[model samples]
Target chain A: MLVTGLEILRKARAEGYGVGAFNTNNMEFTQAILEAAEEMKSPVILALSEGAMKYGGRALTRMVVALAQEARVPVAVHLDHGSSYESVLKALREGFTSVMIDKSHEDFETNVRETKRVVEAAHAVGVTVEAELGRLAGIEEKDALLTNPEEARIFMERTGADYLAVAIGTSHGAYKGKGRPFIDHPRLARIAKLVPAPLVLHGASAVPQELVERFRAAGGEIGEASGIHPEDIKKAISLGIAKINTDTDLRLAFTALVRETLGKNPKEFDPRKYLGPAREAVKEVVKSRMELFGSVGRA
Target chain B: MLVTGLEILRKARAEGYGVGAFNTNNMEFTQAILEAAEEMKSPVILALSEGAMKYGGRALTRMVVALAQEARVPVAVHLDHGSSYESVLKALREGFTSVMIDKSHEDFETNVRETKRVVEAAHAVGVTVEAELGRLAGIEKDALLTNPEEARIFMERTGADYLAVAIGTSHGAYKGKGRPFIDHPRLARIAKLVPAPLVLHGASAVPQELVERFRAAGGEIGEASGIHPEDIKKAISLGIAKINTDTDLRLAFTALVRETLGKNPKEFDPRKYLGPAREAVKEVVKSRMELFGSVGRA
Candidate 1:
């Protein structure tokens, strides 16, 4: 049931749908993602961030990989943001079916050659590669480093990346726009038409108000935290976005249920008492997102 | 590193020391046990209760086996208190290095036959079997006490790898009698006659500080007692080779989780709180290993 991300995304790009890529660090989180996909009959990508993979270490990573192999639906273990060649090298040897290379915008054209070389190694072994066309707002926190459609077309053909991670005004983590979280649809539409390869949306978690409310009621101080609109996510999928990546929403659900469980059950001290419900919360969040991405029954 | 109880107990029985057998269910608990032993350089037993084995099923069991193999010291995966033939069979197939079968006390006639057959099946696969004798009378009971003569005779007839004798210890909050007393005289008799490594079931030294910590962290826990550490040392000296300690671990894990979450209400990540609890469990296991005299026995 383990397949390359390209194989899963190719059909999606042609049929106009998106697969949910959720990040995880341990067994319970991995299980929640796989269980949600199995129950919904949707193909899912399990993304391990660079630090998350390091946090889990080799033994735990193998356990996560084992869960992906056991899933009933098509599952791809993708390295979410491989910022270094060593990161991609580890994923390549660790049974990761997909990988993403993040780099500086320009060097003496070294970024392109480095990405293209990795593409050759991955493509030779049937692994899919995703190259990010724009850097996240570290340099843009102070107009946003949105992806340019003109550069995306060249970036796609130049590197032969199976898919492209295009930045269109979305940022990672809890804090987002003051009111309405914005997505440059015109920019996305232009890039989707210019590039034939599938497009990916990063930091697309639609952090629901209900989850945030319960989390705060239990004793959270995550003030003014918001996420992308579900309508924006659906619209982006309708274009050429074949993979929708989410991390904040699932993490929010996990903490919300855990805090709520511990707060209500004062006499209960079992970690499982709280951790079990948190994992279930993670599953529920993933199921809803899979539904939002229209990946239900796509298996 | 995943060796049978027979292998570990054989050496311990001969050397006159005890090995700690800690129970676990998930990854954190497994890590705690393995980490404690590896740090102490002690050979340890990772016990999976029959219910826990069912909870994890095939993949969880294999993961535990792989972890044991990866450990730096000797390790045994034992099915703790497997009360049925089916449980023993499943443990053997699932790569458990050792198993314990619980049965009706009066049915040694039936229990012995079942135990002997399991020993044969388990031994064929390089596994070990533990059979409990004496109803481990809590708060001192005359009728259910283990008879030294019957125990010595039973092991010879059944060919078990190890024996769980009914010392004064029992499961849960050991209360009632002002201070509990181990049947040391009785245990000595069984150890001298049985000639196999002895097991002490439910012998966790429920440290009073941990109990108070659990109570102070917005939890209600009974103030009933536990066996004295001096008593455990004396028992280890008297041939108690493997000790089962679940209450101490459960209390430590729960107490720290409550403390962390109650103290830091904003902490929501499961690992954020569970990591502290796991470390507490590891500390408790290591302390028990220290008392058992298994430290650096690897």
Candidate 2:
């Protein structure tokens, strides 16, 4: 069925479950995500990051999403975190059905002002808006920083967001050093209740033991321990979280598969020879996440 | 000013030299070709093959040409040896200022018939048409071969405007194993006598030096022995005009730069590295423009 985040979130609220927002950069990844969603009978969101936009031009990205939209299962093409107003406007023009205006770094009043402007702009174009609150830590590249909870509440109250991504112990990329995920479940639950919007947890990759072990065993020197715990993610989902961002896990999954495949066969050069397997590996990751989110067969 | 194939031929008639049509695919190639033309102030043509359209897209190819057109010299976008009618139509839609419909594979009668069809279509769209005769030997990934005499007659009958003769030259990625180009002088004579329009030759530029340099730089390349520039100059001076160079420049840019840059790992960013490689491409193009002797004649 052709549906929007509004429809999906409404359904999720009644059913007591969350949706999976998967990151995709190119046609292979899009094909893997859509095929996985179809096989798992899940309604998935294909999220595009700014870095992805830089790599694949606007027309090409739209072409991939258009191809995915022809799938039997429901797929929402979304812009993950639109940094600039021009980018949000361009995404809308380029056929993104949903957009997130990340103004978490700005002061509470400024965050609300900018988020409301984006919300108005996106809603006018029939795109749902996902805004972030309480900045998540970790430098994305060298510049970006995280937000605090006091500012998060103030931003949410003024912005009137459809969904609020809170930084309740969740951070982007590999952790500063090898350590256990220190998620504040109580803080996440409190924000979920206070926001009056669907909660989103970004950087929610739980690097599985077997996957990590396989990656490291296959000549990859990944840190000893990284990523959020599945149990923590489950707890967040249980507390009215409607969406989970899982980029690192998918990367790890694809990296593990590519490493293992390359390790076994040293003479493969054709992309189809190995990327075919890589595609299947990505599908496996998405399917696992869909089931974990308990949103499988929800489409 | 917007110029036509007829205008190019008229100029060639007076000047006794054919224009160099350089094929370009991406931003680096476009910048290289345009810089060369601007530096030389030469009247140049940018050519795109059907395969090039598949490599990038029609819109992408046009966008590159649009950048070239903004150059300070005369530049025309030409479609080189379009095998199918659909391919020709796409070139027209993509705003190629000139097109060559290569029905050279067909016998004389069929070749004339199809050439006439394309000429009429392109004329209607304000685009000039160049048609081929004489089957150029050597695998062109599949290009039509034409007999020289049949090519002359086809040009006259079809009013093709420009004819590309398939002399001994082959399509690029030179294997160095063909008979030296023996058809240029004969083809040049035919080109001088042909009254329909200007002449074009396929698979010109031996690119042997570039291949050696690429190999020396650690690039793994297939054996490519392209036609030499001396031969190109001889043909251009005589009557064989509008030389189609696709494979030579492709090798010049990719093989040399990629192989050389692979040795350095510290420079991870593309801009810092591609800058020099882009200049290398410009150097190749400037040298080709000089060899073609089309400089400052716009």
Candidate 3:
């Protein structure tokens, strides 16, 4: 069933848990997310970025959601960080159940005005809107930095966004050590108290130490990495972090498996020989995240 | 009408000049090429690459060709540098008039074997084959390097349908500042010796001044370059028939207009901007067609 973020997030708030927002680019990512959610009995949000939009075009949305028509768990197809109005409109027309208008790049007033415009457009078509308040430091494909809190609050209310993606000091990509991220918990608590909406943490991939160790032992070179503690993330969920974004961890997990497989079997020619393992690695990551986010057994 | 490479080359040879094979990515590029050809009264070939195939998908072939179907002058849609056999069949099924099996990356025997396989598939579907003999260097999207006499022998053995005879030319982007390279005598000699009806040259664009202009206008510095004029001159002077012109013109057109828009804030509407850019592109192509001695030849 194609449920909106509002429908699921409301239920998640009632159930006191965070819903996992899985980033999907190809067929394998799509299959892993849907299958993992169904097996775990957790509601899932499949997120599509603008770069992915450029690669496959509008047909990608339909191709992903059509496969989920008969799944046991509810699924919501969402436009994650939609850059422009044209992109948002295209996503809605192509069957997205939820969308995030990331006008965080603009000023607070402009961000609010543009986000509200999209909210009206999406609401008219029975879709939900998620908007980012603070700037996420790192670039999605490259390394960047994290977001500050006061700016996050001001932008959140200015837009009255359905969900606000706070940077919360959690960086994108893998880190070098287990150093603690300077997460402003007080800021998150304030936003939760003032804003009448759920909060979203944009780049919180806690690169599992075990997964990293396993890959490195198999001759993989994923450098020292750290994420906001799972317990810390659990606290954020309790304090209104409704959605958690995980992409680097998926890449880390998949690439580690793929690199190891390719290195071990240089003569392996078939795509299935490698792509199958990569897909399984993605499934494993999503399944574990779904359990940690407390979204399992909700179907 | 959609004509094959052999037919176009045959016509060009009977008259005196070469046909223009322009690389196209989208419907706009296709429309622009056909519109330019019709205005100039010259025949044009639409060349697509494997990277382009992945970008546009199989449906783009028919969608772009439909625009040319209504044109008064001749237009041929040909696949350029198709590496795999699957791409060859898809291009033919989608109604391309010509196909090139670019096996220049493989060894001599493998190149011939694959070219023969593609030739069989394309010819079975009534599409003409444009087989590559020598490989051209430099980077466009994909790299293709080739050898000469061995290339000729391979083409002869495979009985390839037209050949892209690489002399000393390289694919156009931005690169080292040196005199443009061409093996015209070699290309002409190959053309004279080969059994194939037409000869094609890949990466045959002049980009020396254009690269400098782009760099002067706040463009990033890279290798300043393009194919030497002597090679183009020799290719045209000799048996070299069809010329591929993409990088020289596209960069000139896109860079000029993009700078114009980026420099000027008041120009918001795309048509206000893109109209002149499109015209610039058309003019560059028209100039190439005139230079290729293809005018009034359709």
Candidate 4:
């Protein structure tokens, strides 16, 4: 049931919905994502960050591939925020169904050429490519380049990229600045009209206040993390955002559950006693996102 | 490289050392055990209990197999306490190198008949078998049976490649009644008679200090619980070839994870937390193997 990333995103774009691209770091997380997708009957993209790839290596890749192959629903293993051409090529060579070439840190022409090389090589293998046009803050490549609608149109056509990750104001990690976060809907609409390919909204984790408060109460110190509002996420989807990358929400849920469970039961040492609940928390987050993205039953 | 259970056990037996057979519940535990074995250059056995097998299923088996294949040291995938014949057969079909058939609850005749059937079937496939003789208290059987004479006879009649005998140690969590206790001298007596490799159950290190640390960290564990490391070393030296350990590593891993992430709350992703915790489990295993004198024997 493992499909190319473009295949899922193209379907989502056509249907006017957004697919949840949840990040996975280990076996339990992978299991949780796949289980939620199956339960919700939604097509899911399993995003592996560059940090994650180094943390797990080839064994991790094989685990994801095997799990995806066994899933009842369509699952795509995507390299999220791949920082280099070599990294994207490595992912594609390792059987990843899709990859994101994040060369936004470079000049526009360089980014296009870098993405073009990856797109050509990836498409040769029937794998899809996602190239970032704007860089999100807090990530390794930190910059804010809102995708100019005309530039997005040219980038997609010139690089032959299937998906374009656009930056509107969201940043990676848990610490999003204080106050209500904003998503440039007007810019999103312009890019949607200008670019033919599906658009991706990275760092879209909705850092729920309750989850953060619970984590803080349970001895955590994460401060004022916020994300695109659910309504804004819905608006973006309606306007042509076909994929929403979520990592911070899943991290918050996992951290909160682990802290709470351990803080309550100090006598427990069995990992399943805590990690099992953590995985469940992750599943709930993913399921809720699937629902919010209107991807439920989209399989 | 992956080796047969007897291949490792025979080396342990000849060298007068005990191989630590630690149980694995998931990917992290499996990785920790294998990583420790590779680091210490020790021949290790990755034991999977029936409960553990069901918890992770075939994907668990595949994970262990793939990890074992890539390990630099000798590794064996063993079914710790397979309750039924079907389970043992399933493990064998799934490429388990060794399996333990725990039929101690049944009468001596039934135990021999069941184990004999497994031995014949498994030996045909070049898979080694470990069968339990005496029942451990508080486990599935919940009875104590110490018969050194019967153990020797059963070993000969059943042709089991390895023998797990119940001594004074109890099974599952919480060690035997308080106060420093010794594994019945009967274990040495049985090893004197039973020529096959002898095994010990419930040999977890229940380190009291760790229990205290877990308790202080919000763990509600009551009463002092553990096995004497001295007793374990003594048993290892007294012909106890394979030592079964699960609770100790599980306790160490869980305790370290709780302490680490609880102290550093900002960490959320599993790899940052679980990866360090996995290393702690590896350290525990490596230390235990060192205590059992199995290091550098790979």
Error of 1 at B185 (Å): 0.8
Error of 4 at A17 (Å): 0.8
Candidate 1 lDDT, tens digit per residue, B1-298?
8888878887887887889998888889999999999999999999899778777876678889999999989999999877766567567646688887886364778878878876765665467889877786674345476778889877988888899988788877663355677878888888889888989887877778988988999679776687788988888888889998888898899988999999998989999889999999999999998888899999
Q: What is each model's TM-score for chain A?
A: 0.95, 0.90, 0.90, 0.96
- Global lDDT of each candidate: 0.83, 0.71, 0.73, 0.83
For B1-298, candidate 3 gives per-residue lDDT tens digits of 7777787777676565778898877765676778789989998888888777777874676676676666788888888888777667557645677888877767778888999987765665467888886567532123243344665687778766677876656665643356645555565566666645555554545565666767666577476566665556556656567888778666766766767777887888877766766776787788778877889888
**Candidate 4 structure quality by residue, lDDT tens digits, B1-298:** 8777888898787788999999998988998898888889999999888888789887898889778878888898898878876677667655688987888988989999989987865775568999888777532133365588998889889888988877766655577666445555777788789878888888887778778777766587766566788888888777888998888887778887788788888978888778877887888899889988999999
Global fold similarity of model 2 (TM-score): 0.49
| Chain B TM, every candidate | 0.96, 0.88, 0.88, 0.94
Show where candidate 1 strays beyond 4 Å: A1-299
Q: Model 1, residue A218: displacement in angstroms?
A: 81
Query: Which is superior by lDDT, 2 or 4?
Result: 4
- Between candidates 3 and 4, the lDDT winner: 4
The TM-score of predicted model 4 comes to 0.51
Clashes of 1: 0
Candidate 2, position A107, lDDT: 69
